[PDB]
Amino acid sequence: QQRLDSLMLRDRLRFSAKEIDQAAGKVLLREAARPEITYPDNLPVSQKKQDILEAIRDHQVVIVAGETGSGKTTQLPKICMELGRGIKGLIGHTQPRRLAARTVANRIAEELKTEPGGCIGYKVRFSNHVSDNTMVKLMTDGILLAEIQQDRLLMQYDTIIIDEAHERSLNIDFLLGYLKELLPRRPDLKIIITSATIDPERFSRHFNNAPIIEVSGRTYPVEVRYRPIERDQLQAIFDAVDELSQESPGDILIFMSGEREIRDTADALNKLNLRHTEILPLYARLSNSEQNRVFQSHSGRRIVLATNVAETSLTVPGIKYVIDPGTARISRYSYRTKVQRLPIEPISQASANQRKGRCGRVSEGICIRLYSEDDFLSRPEFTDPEILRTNLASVILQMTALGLGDIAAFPFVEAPDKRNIQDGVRLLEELGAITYKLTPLGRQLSQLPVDPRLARMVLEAQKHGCVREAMIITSALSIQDPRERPMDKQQASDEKHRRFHDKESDFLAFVNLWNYLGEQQKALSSNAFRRLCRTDYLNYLRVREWQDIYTQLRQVVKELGIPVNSEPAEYREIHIALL
Amino acid sequence: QQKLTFTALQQRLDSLMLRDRLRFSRRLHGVKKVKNPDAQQAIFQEMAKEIDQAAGKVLLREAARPEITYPDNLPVSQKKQDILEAIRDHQVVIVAGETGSGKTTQLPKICMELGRGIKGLIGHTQPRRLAARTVANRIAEELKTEPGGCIGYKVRFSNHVSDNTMVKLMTDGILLAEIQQDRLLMQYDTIIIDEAHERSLNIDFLLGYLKELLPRRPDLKIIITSATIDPERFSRHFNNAPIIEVSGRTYPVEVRYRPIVEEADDTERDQLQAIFDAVDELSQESPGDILIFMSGEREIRDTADALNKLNLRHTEILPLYARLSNSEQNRVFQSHSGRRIVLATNVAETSLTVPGIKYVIDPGTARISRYSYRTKVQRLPIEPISQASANQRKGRCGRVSEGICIRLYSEDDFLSRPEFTDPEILRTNLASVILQMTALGLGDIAAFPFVEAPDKRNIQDGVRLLEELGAITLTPLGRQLSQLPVDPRLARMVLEAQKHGCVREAMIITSALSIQDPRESDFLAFVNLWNYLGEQQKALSSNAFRRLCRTDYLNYLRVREWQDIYTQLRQVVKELGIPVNSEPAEYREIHIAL
Numbered sequence A: 001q002q003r004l005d006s007l008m009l010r011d012r013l014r015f016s017a018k019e020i021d022q023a024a025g026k027v028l029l030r031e032a033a034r035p036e037i038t039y040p041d042n043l044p045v046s047q048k049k050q051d052i053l054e055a056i057r058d059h060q061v062v063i064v065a066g067e068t069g070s071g072k073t074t075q076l077p078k079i080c081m082e083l084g085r086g087i088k089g090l091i092g093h094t095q096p097r098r099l100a101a102r103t104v105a106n107r108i109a110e111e112l113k114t115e116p117g118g119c120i121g122y123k124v125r126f127s128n129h130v131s132d133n134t135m136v137k138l139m140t141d142g143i144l145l146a147e148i149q150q151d152r153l154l155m156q157y158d159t160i161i162i163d164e165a166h167e168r169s170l171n172i173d174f175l176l177g178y179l180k181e182l183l184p185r186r187p188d189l190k191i192i193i194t195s196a197t198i199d200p201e202r203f204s205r206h207f208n209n210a211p212i213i214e215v216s217g218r219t220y221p222v223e224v225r226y227r228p229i230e231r232d233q234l235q236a237i238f239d240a241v242d243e244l245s246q247e248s249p250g251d252i253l254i255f256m257s258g259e260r261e262i263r264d265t266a267d268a269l270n271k272l273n274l275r276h277t278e279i280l281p282l283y284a285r286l287s288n289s290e291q292n293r294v295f296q297s298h299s300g301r302r303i304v305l306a307t308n309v310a311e312t313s314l315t316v317p318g319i320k321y322v323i324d325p326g327t328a329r330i331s332r333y334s335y336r337t338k339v340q341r342l343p344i345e346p347i348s349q350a351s352a353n354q355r356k357g358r359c360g361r362v363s364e365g366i367c368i369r370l371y372s373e374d375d376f377l378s379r380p381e382f383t384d385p386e387i388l389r390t391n392l393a394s395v396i397l398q399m400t401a402l403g404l405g406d407i408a409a410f411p412f413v414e415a416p417d418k419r420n421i422q423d424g425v426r427l428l429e430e431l432g433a434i435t436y437k438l439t440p441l442g443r444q445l446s447q448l449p450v451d452p453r454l455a456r457m458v459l460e461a462q463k464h465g466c467v468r469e470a471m472i473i474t475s476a477l478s479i480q481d482p483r484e485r486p487m488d489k490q491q492a493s494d495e496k497h498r499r500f501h502d503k504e505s506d507f508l509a510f511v512n513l514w515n516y517l518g519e520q521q522k523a524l525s526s527n528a529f530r531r532l533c534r535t536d537y538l539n540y541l542r543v544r545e546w547q548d549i550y551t552q553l554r555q556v557v558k559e560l561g562i563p564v565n566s567e568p569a570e571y572r573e574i575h576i577a578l579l
Numbered sequence B: 001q002q003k004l005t006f007t008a009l010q011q012r013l014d015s016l017m018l019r020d021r022l023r024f025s026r027r028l029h030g031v032k033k034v035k036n037p038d039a040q041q042a043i044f045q046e047m048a049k050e051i052d053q054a055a056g057k058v059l060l061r062e063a064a065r066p067e068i069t070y071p072d073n074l075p076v077s078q079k080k081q082d083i084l085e086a087i088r089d090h091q092v093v094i095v096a097g098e099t100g101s102g103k104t105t106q107l108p109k110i111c112m113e114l115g116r117g118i119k120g121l122i123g124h125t126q127p128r129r130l131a132a133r134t135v136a137n138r139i140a141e142e143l144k145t146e147p148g149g150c151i152g153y154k155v156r157f158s159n160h161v162s163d164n165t166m167v168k169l170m171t172d173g174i175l176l177a178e179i180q181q182d183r184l185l186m187q188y189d190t191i192i193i194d195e196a197h198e199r200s201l202n203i204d205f206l207l208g209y210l211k212e213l214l215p216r217r218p219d220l221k222i223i224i225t226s227a228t229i230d231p232e233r234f235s236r237h238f239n240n241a242p243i244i245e246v247s248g249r250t251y252p253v254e255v256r257y258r259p260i261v262e263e264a265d266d267t268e269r270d271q272l273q274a275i276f277d278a279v280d281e282l283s284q285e286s287p288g289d290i291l292i293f294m295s296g297e298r299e300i301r302d303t304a305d306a307l308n309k310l311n312l313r314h315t316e317i318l319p320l321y322a323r324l325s326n327s328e329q330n331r332v333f334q335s336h337s338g339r340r341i342v343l344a345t346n347v348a349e350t351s352l353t354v355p356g357i358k359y360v361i362d363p364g365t366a367r368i369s370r371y372s373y374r375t376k377v378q379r380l381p382i383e384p385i386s387q388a389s390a391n392q393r394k395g396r397c398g399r400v401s402e403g404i405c406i407r408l409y410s411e412d413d414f415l416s417r418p419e420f421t422d423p424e425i426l427r428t429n430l431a432s433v434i435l436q437m438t439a440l441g442l443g444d445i446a447a448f449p450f451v452e453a454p455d456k457r458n459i460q461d462g463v464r465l466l467e468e469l470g471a472i473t474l475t476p477l478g479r480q481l482s483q484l485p486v487d488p489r490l491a492r493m494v495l496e497a498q499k500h501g502c503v504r505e506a507m508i509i510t511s512a513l514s515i516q517d518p519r520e521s522d523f524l525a526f527v528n529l530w531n532y533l534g535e536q537q538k539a540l541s542s543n544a545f546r547r548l549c550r551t552d553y554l555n556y557l558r559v560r561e562w563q564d565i566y567t568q569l570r571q572v573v574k575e576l577g578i579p580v581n582s583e584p585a586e587y588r589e590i591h592i593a594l
């Protein structure tokens, strides 16, 4: 048994004698395939790698916290390899987003002059690029959670890097809880929690007061300019862009609430024909020749439009200026409507300071906040973690889908409100989702990224050929009402909104408004369809958010093989489905 | 509450998916040995609620069933009821027909119309990974559904299959690898083996394994899909299974023999001028696109370049490469103004259907894997194709009347060729066959029901070789050897080269020994010639390193074949995660490797 501590972890678990020499050949082939480890000398993490290495070496859990762009994501797996990890088990490295897992794997592989799927591989939904020589496995946190069922000790891995951990999604908190549970039985496993410098002490306390290595390099103070306050919303961006294009060379990063807003803004900025200015929209659906032009050199000024993926996870090069509208989609349960919603809300101070911080890698960066200093100082210091703003039915459903056990025994970094547990269990039973074990219906519910009660209605519409109408309604119920009624009029707003009133149920006013919002962004220009939404007292951003949510929901529904009517269904099978 | 029984529970298992019915059935079998009837009743009560749950899986999948439609103009669509009834009434069916009949894209639909694909998957194998994905995307589009929904696919590095997937396209290699974990192939109620006339090792392993499996899977249905090349052999293999011939009307094709005139005294320029002359001959005829068959993708590139320098009137040159943009992919099936000249490898012989072809130019060659008893190596020579393959190439202009196929060889040459291509099982060293069989767990090669058995006189030497290399006793080393599509001993050198950072040089040697020479220390002549030919071909102008190869005893066409084979080998090595040095390795850490 002393000889097999140099065997691979799954093999070593198996045995503990000449079928050992065989297994030991696997290790020694993998050691032969290990590349030469190199680092770009200009990154703070590369310069500070020796302290990081020693911390990982001497501690089971390390928290690495630092400004975006420090080199955490691309260099930390290399440090683990230099320390000798990744031979007898994999270095697992989670990302919140599927796109980031693949992009990071390709980037590290290229920096090491290797082929992705070799020493650096990745696993996301529909793509498992991992060979027998893979040492570092990039993946989404959802992928790693789904592996727990078939491998409860995670014996595939000798090292797990939880990246972007400050996002505090449910997936991240499930992993941090499961890993803490797992550590007494995996004394050979090493954990690295990787984060922006946002309250890393909370991660430290969770892991038995683990050391925090703060790896930020030099940052320069950023000038903040406050510019308070549809085109009133869009024109503020125009004014900020004009202001900043007077400053010294340097690209502008504009934070946006969603991809349809990015597209409208990119269309508008392009017809403005800014001299020697390139507009670059960052969408999730970008081509493989669009990936790197983000990172390609460029001649004039570049205006990058992005969602908050560019807040801390992605570093756009060459950024000197930021325009911050100060808002973001965030998942939040509404106690008024008893629905898990996606309101557009003012971001926390921590998030606003991360957006500002993207100008501070060079001197004299400028951040324009489209709101008042008064507003900023009123905002919370931190963003609520998702676990504290999600209905417990959704939480329990996902824990049951992953086999994480009872929500009351789980060692959360921050526990949800125990008073809501029984109503969450009750709801899932009434929805036919559980018995805890998932039902086949429950598994389909877990795969729909909307409130479970709304998801149940989508599944029921599949029996009646009106999933299209189910998705219009459910997406409409996942936002704040797009129909503004300013008591500054109260007069034309409701009389223009009653054009879509329906006979039986109020939910089909959403269907009529949806069809009306179609036929109009086809007739009208994108700037005069926009104009139509103040003319019609519609909140421009919510309508765009309504369309974004529907589009994403329809893609998921179709990917699951759920049928979607090509032709609008009629009123009877729409309501037997809701009723 | 109320009493359950073995028979009633067992009759419930017919509303389940086949894998669930198997599991429940084996659980109930165990209950038959429980002596305490109260413990049997308790197990029953628990199990009837899990059966109730499992039956919901079936009704979710039935809700996802798409509406089945067929394109009017396909012979298979016109014959759909005869095909459906044959599949319905027979466990095994042979579907044979001309390329373009609609076999690949419509046969899975017919199985869905029959009601299959709900309780198990309709598995549909392809020889090529790109074809599995492309076919899945095409059927999904025809059904107006999203790929990964009812129509999905599974290939290396991509598993596009959901809980509602009814048709699973995959490579035959993927299906073979699934046998370890699912020996009865209970995931599937139907298996379609496509392009079966290719008679690769993978196809023959599946046909033998499926034949063995059928007495244990009376619920399983098999469809063997083939070009009309001796489908009677498939029928005999499956106990005289019916052959459904799904070709439409046959339009005879005019053959012209144009043996290559050695006018220009070259070989490359002689082949190219012969192609030019054939293109001129065909451009006198009525409107219609031309398909030119080529032996490899580097040949395609040179030919497309040469045809572009001709400044042809109203003519587009369109080379077909395996890694084409899938929006350049789409351009084959796209309309166009003038004449189009399509250049393709034999992927366009039976597997791919290029639209609008009226004319074919056939040089008559293809790369084929063939073991050499001299040189004791599994090689990949370019050799003359069989009569059957030449007739398949000819048939690609047979969609309408008045097609013309120009063969760049004589009728005597055509008649000298064998009637059929040797199946791969008969031209592969048995060390490779045994290695791949043991990796797959197919059992002893002497007990395997091959459509055509290999020469058993080679067996014990194959076992001998794999023992000497340390591949069997399967080893961890043997499994890595199985993954390399080269001679097993050369594969041994590739893996040993990985220890010393010279897999690049190992691949130079391997590719040089799998072709005929462009002209232990003789193998280091291969490396030095390769390095020189690499260096010279970045400095010299586009299309002027050709002259450089007469300087020495180098024939450009052999060098180009060497480079093509190396390039394809490097792709396979990369996909296996084996690192390849970008920089030329240093001396004889190449001998420590050899």
Ligand SMILES: Nc1ncnc2c1ncn2[C@@H]1O[C@H](COP(=O)(O)OP(=O)(O)O)[C@@H](O)[C@H]1O
Residues within 6 Å of the ligand: A043, A066, A067, A068, A069, A070, A071, A072, A073, A074, A075, A103, A107, A295, A312, A313, A314, A315, A316, A317
């Ligand atoms: N795909 C890529 N292409 C080019 N440069 C990149 C890529 N990914 C990251 N970089 C650069 O490497 C640096 C380090 O990035 P990263 O490791 O993600 O830092 P952190 O995780 O600390 O924010 C950044 O400045 C970034 O611009």
Ligand SMILES: Nc1ncnc2c1ncn2[C@@H]1O[C@H](COP(=O)(O)OP(=O)(O)O)[C@@H](O)[C@H]1O
Residues within 6 Å of the ligand: B074, B097, B098, B099, B100, B101, B102, B103, B104, B105, B106, B134, B138, B333, B350, B351, B353, B354, B355
């Ligand atoms: N990806 C595709 N795009 C457009 N048309 C296609 C595609 N695949 C097949 N087809 C058309 O459908 C017809 C049937 O092709 P297929 O089902 O592959 O026939 P077979 O398998 O009998 O050769 C062919 O004529 C082909 O041109």
Ligand SMILES: [Mg+2]
Residues within 6 Å of the ligand: A072, A073, A074, A163, A164, A312, A313
């Ligand atoms: Mg990062």
Ligand SMILES: [Mg+2]
Residues within 6 Å of the ligand: B103, B104, B105, B194, B195, B350, B351
């Ligand atoms: Mg076919």
